[PDB]
Each structure stands twice: as C-alpha cells, then as structure tokens.
Ligand SMILES: *[C@@H]1O[C@H](CO)[C@@H](O)[C@H](O)[C@H]1NC(C)=O
Ligand SMILES: *[C@@H]1O[C@H](CO)[C@@H](O)[C@H](O)[C@H]1NC(C)=O
Ligand SMILES: *[C@@H]1O[C@H](CO)[C@@H](O)[C@H](O)[C@H]1NC(C)=O
C-alpha cells in the first residue's frame with residue numbers, strides 16, 4: 001500500500017526532511033531471509049516506490 | 050494550548066544616523082522574555098546591545114540605530130539573546146552594516162550647449178528621507194574629456210541644501226560630453242554631463258512617418274511624409290514613399306538585384322499641413338519567408354530643385370512573431386487558499402486584439418480547462434481549481450506545447466507568441482496561509498487602500514483559541530515603515546476566506562510597497578508571504594506655477610506665480626519647451642528623483658554576507674531520526690516559508706521553522722541633434738513667502754514656441770516640491 | 779610658466795584652470811629635465827651638441 005512520498009503533513013522541526021532510504025538489511029526482508037511471506041499490521045514501511 | 054513563540058524579524062541592512070525600524074513578535078504567554086540583539090564580539094565593545102522589552106501579543110516596534118561603522122561595510126555575527134530567567138537561545142548572523150551617506154543630485158538647464166556662452170548649473174542635497182540637507186563637500190569639478198578638470202570650486206557650503214553656479218566656456222571645445230564630478234567625505238560620487246558643439250542651424254528638414262510593427266492581416270495603412278524647411282512651413286512639391294523587401298542578411302556575392310518585393314507610391318505635396326499617403330498591406334504580400342521590407346522615402350521639391358535625400362525608418366521591423374499575446378497580471382504567487390487570478394491579454398500591430406476572440410485556457414496538471422474570450426472592457430480574469438502537488442505550469446494558446454518540431458534545421462521556425470507560465474508552491478507544511486492578489490493597477494495618493502486578503506485554515510485550527518493573531522508588515526528597501534495588528538475570531542473547523550486589511554499611502558516608501566502578512570500559530574509554525582504593490586509618484590510639498598496668460602511678444606511685463614508650502618528655497622528655471630520637446634527630460638522629474646535614490650532594495654543575501662550557523666551546517670548529521678530518512682539542512686524551495694523572509698530582505702531568530710545557511714550542504718537539480726535657439730530665458734533663486742511669491746517674469750520676445758519652467762522647490766517645512774509640468778504658449 | 783602668478787592675484791580669473799596648468803607643468807618641468815643639456819644649456823631636445 002504505502003509509498004515513499006506519502007504523509008503530506010508537517011515536516012521535521014529543525015530542517016526539512018525530504019524522502020530517501022538506506023541500503024541496510026531490512027525487516028520485510030527477514031521474512032524473505034526466512035524464505036517466506038506474511039501479512040501484517042506491524043510496520044514494514046520502507047522503499048516500495 | 051500552545052508553546053512559546055518569539056520571532057524578532059531583523060533587516061540586516063543598516064543605515065547610520067537615520068531611523069531604521071526594529072520590531073519583535075511574542076505570543077502564547079509563558080515566564081519572561083527580555084530578548085537583546087548584541088553584535089557578538091570577543092568583548093562587549095562593538096555590541097549594539099539592544100535589550101528590547103518583550104511581552105506577549107504586542108507589536109511596539111522600536112527604531113534602534115547604530116553609530117558609524119569602522120569601515121564602510123563590515124560583517125559582525127549578531128545574536129538575539131532570548132533573555133529568559135532559565136532559557137537562553139543563540140543563533141548568530143552577520144550584520145550588513147553600511148556607512149550610508151546622504152544623497153545629492155545635480156540639476157542642469159541643458160546638456161547640449163553652443164560654444165561661447167555661460168553654462169550655469171545647480172547641485173542639491175538631501176538625506177535618507179526626502180528633506181533638504183545642508184552639508185559641506187570635499188570638492189566639485191567640471192571635467193573636460195582629456196582627463197583634465199575644466200571647472201573647479203573648493204569646499205563650499207550649501208545655503209539651503211543646494212547651491213547654484215555660473216561657469217564660462219571657451220568657444221573652442223572638443224565638441225562632446227563634458228562631465229561634472231562630486232566627491233563626499235566618505236567618497237560618494239555623482240555625475241551629470243553636458244555636451245557642446247558649434248552645430249550649424251540647418252534651414253532644411255524632412256520627416257517620414259510609418260508604423261513600426263504591422264501584422265499580416267491588415268486592411269490599409271497611413272504614412273505621413275513631408276519635407277519642411279524649418280518644420281513649420283508646409284511646402285509644395287512631390288514625394289514618393291518606396292518600400293522593398295530586399296533580403297534577410299543578403300550577401301550580394303550573388304550580385305542579383307537584392308530587391309525581392311517593391312511597392313511604389315507617389316503624390317504631390319500638400320501646401321497646408323504636411324502630406325499624407327495611404328498604402329495597403331495586401332499588396333506587400335508580407336509573407337513569412339519573405340524578407341526585410343525597408344521603409345524609406347524620396348522627396349523632390351518643385352520651383353527650387355535642391356533635392357536632398359533621407360533614409361528615415363530605413364531599417365524596418367522584422368515581426369518574426371505574429372499575433373503576439375503576453376501576460377498582464379499573472380499572479381506573483383499561486384496558492385490554494387483562494388482561486389488566484391492570473392491575467393493575459395493580446396497585442397497585435399496597432400495594439401487591438403480581435404473583439405471577443407475565444408481563448409484556450411488550459412492550466413495543465415490541474416486539468417481545469419475553461420475557455421474564455423477577451424472582453425472589450427475586461428481581460429481574462431480566470432482561475433483553475435488545483436488538486437495536485439507543488440509542480441504546476443499554465444499556458445494559453447495551448448493547441449500544443451511546441452508547434453510540431455519535426456525539424457527546422459535552423460532554416461526558419463514558425464514561432465507565434467504563446468504565454469506559458471510555470472509556478473511553484475508555498476512550502477506550507479501546515480497547508481494553511483493567506484493569499485493576497487496583487488494591487489497592480491492605478492493607485493492615486495493621499496488616501497487609504499484596503500487590501501483584499503483571502504485565507505484558509507486546513508483541518509480547521511487543531512486547537513487554536515478564541516482568537517488567533519494575523520499581523521501585517523511592510524518592509525521598505527531594507528527597513529520597516531509602519532505597523533499593523535488585526536485578528537479574527539477563528540471558526541474552529543470550517544473554512545472562511547474574507548480578511549480585512551488596510552494601509553495609508555502618502556510618501557516615504559520604496560518604489561515597491563513590500564507588504565507582508567503572516568499567520569502566527571500556537572504550534573510553532575507561521576505562514577505568510579510577500580505582498581508587493583506599486584508606489585505612485587506623490588510628493589510632500591505640492592506646488593503649482595501660474596503665469597500672466599499668453600499674449601504677444603513685447604509685453605516684457607509678466608508674472609511667474611508659484612504657490613507651495615509657506616517656506617522653501619526654490620529654483621526658477623523658466624525656459625523653452627522646444628529644448629524639452631526635442632528630447633524628454635528623462636533625467637529631471639519627480640519620479641526621476643525618486644528612482645535616482647540608489648540601493649533600491651537589498652533583498653535576500655548580499656555578496657558581503659558571511660555564512661552563519663551553529664549546528665545545521667554540520668554535514669551528515671546522520672543518526673537517530675524517527676522518519677524514513679534525514680535529508681538537506683536547507684529550507685530550499687522557490688517559495689519556502691523562509692524564502693519569504695529572504696524576499697523581504699530580513700532575517701529572524703525563531704523557535705518556529707525558519708533559517709537555512711548558504712555555504713553548507715545543499716542538493717541540486719531536484720550623430721547630430723536638430724536645433725533651435727538655445728538662449729536660456731530665466732535663471733534665479735528666491736524664497737517663497739506664505740501667500741505665494743509672485744515673481745514678475747520677463748518675456749523673451751522674438752521667440753515663439755512652447756515654453757516651460759524647470760522649477761524646483763526644496764524646503765525643510767514641507768520637504769521637496771516640484772511643479773513637474775505646467776504649460777506656457 | 780607664469781600661470782603660477784595668475785591664480786590669486788587677479789580676483790577675476792578662473793584659477794581652476796591655472797591650477798590645472800600647474801598640473802600640466804608637473805610634467806613640463808620633467809620635460810625640461812629631458813630638454814636640458816649636461817653642460818647646463820637648453821634646446822628643443824637636449825644634449826649631444
Ligand atoms: C489612412 O488610410 C485609410 C485608408 O485609405 C483612410 O481611411 C484614412 O483616412 C487614412 N488617414 C490618413 C490621415 O491618411
Ligand atoms: C467554453 O466554456 C463554456 C462554459 O462552460 C462552454 O459552455 C462552452 O461550450 C465552451 N466553448 C467551447 C470551446 O466549446
Ligand atoms: C478549489 O477551489 C475550492 C473553492 O471553490 C477550494 O476550497 C479548494 O481548496 C480548491 N482546490 C482544491 C479542490 O483543493
């Protein structure tokens with residue numbers, strides 16, 4: 001569902017934080033590093049597109 | 050409920066020994082605020098320690114000043130110390146101090162002069178404001194172009210903020226521009242030239258009249274051409290106006306007779322008035338590929354035979370753009386808060402768009418298409434409902450974007466005018482603001498003007514209160530001029546779009562009225578924007594001249610009645626208007642002396658600005674943030690919230706979201722003059738009584754033309770006064 | 779040369795222009811330094827006679 005541009009509400013109070021990400025190993029992947037999939041409400045919210 | 054909000058707006062540009070306003074915002078009460086701006090130095094010596102009392106919900110702006118700076122300009126890191134009892138805030142910024150000097154101008158009767166007479170000139174002095182200023186000067190000197198001072202007077206003193214003179218001249222000058230020099234104690238220099246030449250008075254002159262620009266679709270045309278020996282003696286004879294498309298950049302290596310088209314028209318001169326001829330636009334077949342139709346004439350005089358020739362309007366006007374429309378009042382700042390009203394008209398040839406031509410209004414990426422048509426009295430007053438991201442761009446005549454660029458090969462391209470505009474967003478993370486349409490129309494002076502401001506509050510006011518404050522401020526070329534406080538009982542969760550706002554107009558403002566208005570919120574966020582308005586020329590000491598009415602020559606007895614403020618030292622240059630009709634007075638006028646004032650508005654960051662920050666400039670502040678990422682330190686946008694303080698020219702030290710630095714990491718990409726008698730008529734100084742001094746003017750007989758008085762009243766009782774134009778026949 | 783004696787003594791003259799004449803004479807006396815002779819005499823161009 002989610003995307004990286006969403007949540008057009010207030011910005012960080014010190015500077016503006018536009019949208020970007022990290023190359024590290026992620027949580028949604030740990031479902032795939034197990035080798036499977038799942039359906040969740042806990043947050044896997046990270047760079048889809 | 051709220052937080053503490055302090056916002057002490059500051060124009061960095063300073064002015065020495067002259068009043069510059071300084072204000073402060075505070076609201077949403079807490080313990081104690083006694084903020085103090087101190088130019089941070091290793092010792093408290095250069096510190097302009099300005100401890101301002103700061104209570105909440107007030108605008109009592111204080112015009113703190115500074116003494117002479119060490120140099121002419123300088124940078125000094127300045128901090129407002131938020132002088133709480135247990136809270137202290139520090140954010141440095143370099144101060145654009147400037148040892149601004151008082152302004153002076155020079156007045157001259159003419160620039161051209163005949164070799165042998167006495168050149169006589171005046172110099173004037175004022176200050177930051179528009180009153181006189183009596184002041185000494187190091188030196189003044191007229192300059193001859195060989196690097197030598199042709200006139201020079203030493204360390205005089207002004208009698209009333211000005212001084213007159215009378216200087217001789219040799220009848221053998223280098224016939225050319227002679228310059229006058231001044232140098233103040235600090236080194237401020239002013240320039241006013243005058244040319245000289247023993248120009249022969251020709252007893253022969255000729256004139257051609259042809260329209261400059263003419264579109265393709267025209268029915269007919271007029272060309273007034275006439276050879277008159279002194280410009281006032283409509284002669285008989287015969288004239289022929291010939292025009293020919295020869296070429297666009299012909300080489301004549303080909304040697305072919307360059308003329309492509311030619312259309313010849315001949316007619317006998319008219320004895321009364323100066324002759325008129327009718328030509329039609331279809332016979333030219335002024336086609337696109339067809340080439341430069343030079344506009345020339347040929348006059349032959351009967352009974353005398355001395356046939357002189359003239360190439361007048363000889364270089365024609367290639368109108369590579371046909372049916373050229375434009376913008377009118379394309380809105381300075383697009384906002385969702387009201388339907389903005391950009392505006393567009395069309396001009397063509399003579400300057401008359403087709404009556405009720407329907408236009409193709411497509412503001413795209415909002416997808417609000419609503420065609421309209423030019424009204425005989427109204428232009429297009431349109432709006433597009435945007436429901437989209439910051440990126441927007443509009444255009445009309447929008448059958449395409451580019452014509453059909455299969456190719457041009459630089460051969461020639463079919464470019465008609467299409468008025469496309471690209472716009473950007475208020476970076477308002479609150480999504481709440483006030484849009485102020487521009488007052489870019491006529492604006493008579495000596496009144497008050499209620500501005501029209503329409504606003505929104507998205508998501509209602511989240512908590513707000515019974516009353517939210519909306520102050521409005523007018524920066525003025527590096528400084529504020531007036532204060533304004535207004536509010537409105539904010540409806541909690543429904544949108545309203547009528548805000549009342551007004552301001553008086555007299556004088557004492559930059560040529561642009563940089564109004565600003567902002568929305569002080571309890572949530573540490575404030576949204577506003579610039580509000581530019583014209584300032585029309587309206588002066589302090591309004592004065593009108595009057596003369597004993599126009600009659601015959603020998604009545605040397607006359608009057609030159611002037612009525613101004615009760616006291617003034619005034620110039621009386623009653624002269625000819627022939628020497629103004631041959632050349633308009635672009636140098637001398639009311640609006641002139643308005644716009645000669647330099648430093649029109651030092652907006653944004655100046656060159657001398659040295660960078661400022663404490664922690665934000667630290668590149669790669671890269672850890673521990675509860676978002677997807679953490680991106681530039683900048684407030685970067687075209688209309689970000691701090692870009693509005695930037696377009697003001699003022700900085701701020703604010704607990705809300707304002708400041709960005711510059712040096713620190715930012716991303717990117719995402720001949721001869723026709724002449725008559727130069728004999729000057731009147732030259733003298735007087736001092737007005739209360740009833741209006743009525744100087745008995747002298748008639749200069751044997752000289753009939755249009756006559757003018759370049760008068761100039763300067764006074765500290767009513768400021769400067771000018772009778773900019775009043776006619777004598 | 780005698781423009782020096784004409785600055786103040788007249789009470790009518792324009793001494794700005796003779797004050798510039800001495801400015802020209804500040805090069806004139808160097809020209810004379812260049813128009814001199816070693817033995818002590820003077821000519822249009824100087825020595826070697
Ligand atoms: C200009 O030309 C048009 C067409 O011949 C005519 O209606 C009009 O009277 C002309 N005006 C003058 C001043 O020649
Ligand atoms: C222009 O807009 C009007 C207003 O809705 C509409 O009635 C009309 O059909 C439009 N004209 C065109 C180009 O069809
Ligand atoms: C469109 O205009 C309406 C008023 O007619 C305004 O409320 C709205 O914010 C604008 N754009 C939208 C739909 O967001």
Ligand SMILES: *[C@@H]1O[C@H](CO)[C@@H](O)[C@H](O)[C@H]1NC(C)=O
Pocket residue numbers: 786787788789
């Ligand atoms: C200036 O010239 C006058 C004569 O015109 C002379 O008496 C005087 O000594 C000169 N210098 C002074 C002292 O002004």
